[PDB]
Structure 1
Amino acid sequence: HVSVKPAESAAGSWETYTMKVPSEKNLPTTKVVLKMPKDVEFQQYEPIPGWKVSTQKHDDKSVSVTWEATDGGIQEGQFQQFTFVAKNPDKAEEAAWDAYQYYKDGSIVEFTGDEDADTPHSITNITSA
């Protein structure tokens, strides 16, 4: 389960988010893609050794951030944390973090489900502020 913390944050602020990516298969995780929630504006990322980071804007003006491994990736028994800054929406809402975790066999785990789903996305509760 890919979790973006803090799981609660104030509307209208810049927040320092940390995405934690645990290994869930005995296979290297080689890439992670995080869709920015609607109304969350990505600002900057923090460099991590062994990873190259890039942003991509799509037709619907949605933004995804990609961390790609350059030196083995996340191996069995490991997790890695990826920190970035984003501007929160200006109203209270549920910001859902759709994450895509790429393993070395070419498989992809889509953490995009709801509460009851097998691969759920994590959520930041954006509160009034």
Structure 2
Amino acid sequence: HVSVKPAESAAGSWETYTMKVPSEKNLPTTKVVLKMPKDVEFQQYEPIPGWKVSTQKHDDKSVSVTWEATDGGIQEGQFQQFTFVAKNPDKAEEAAWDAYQYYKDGSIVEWTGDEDADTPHSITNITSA
């Protein structure tokens, strides 16, 4: 399950987020794509050995960040944490973190479901007062 923490954060602020990506298969995780939640503006990423990081704007105005393994990826029995900075929206909202976990066999696990789904996205509660 991919998580982006903190699970609560203040509206309007520049938050340092940490995405944790555990292995869930006995195969390497070679790439992770994270969609920015609505109204959350990506600012910067923290470099990490063994990964190249890039951002993608899209035809719809959403933005994604991609971490691609340049070494062995995340192996069985491992997890990795990836840190970045984003600006929170101005109003209270539930920010969903749609993540796509790529494995070496070409499979993609889509951490995009709601509460009851098999692969839910994690959420940050953007609050105020």
Secondary structure (helix, strand or coil) at the match of 1:118 reads coil
State the identity %. 99
Deviation, structure 1 residue 128: 1.3
How far apart are the structure 2 equivalents of 1:104 and 1:60? 29
Structure 1, residues 97-129: CA drift from partner, whole Å, max 9, x if none? 000000000000000000000000000000016
Q: Where do 1:88-99 residues align within 5 Å?
A: 88-99=88-99
How far apart are the structure 1 equivalents of 2:60 and 2:105? 30
Deviation, structure 1 residue 49: 0.1
Unaligned runs of 5+ in 2: none
How far apart are the structure 2 equivalents of 1:59 and 1:128? 32
Deviation, structure 1 residue 60: 1.1
Give aligned pairs, total. 129
Structure 1, residues 50-98: CA drift from partner, whole Å, max 9, x if none? 0000000001110000000000100000000000000000000000000
Unaligned runs of 5+ in 1: none
Deviation, structure 1 residue 20: 0.1
Q: Under a length normalisation based on structure 1, what TM-score does the superposition of the two structures give?
A: 0.99
Q: Could you say what the CA RMSD is over the residues aligned between the two structures, in angstroms?
A: 0.6
Moved over 2 A (4+): none
Q: Under a length normalisation based on structure 2, what TM-score does the superposition of the two structures give?
A: 0.99
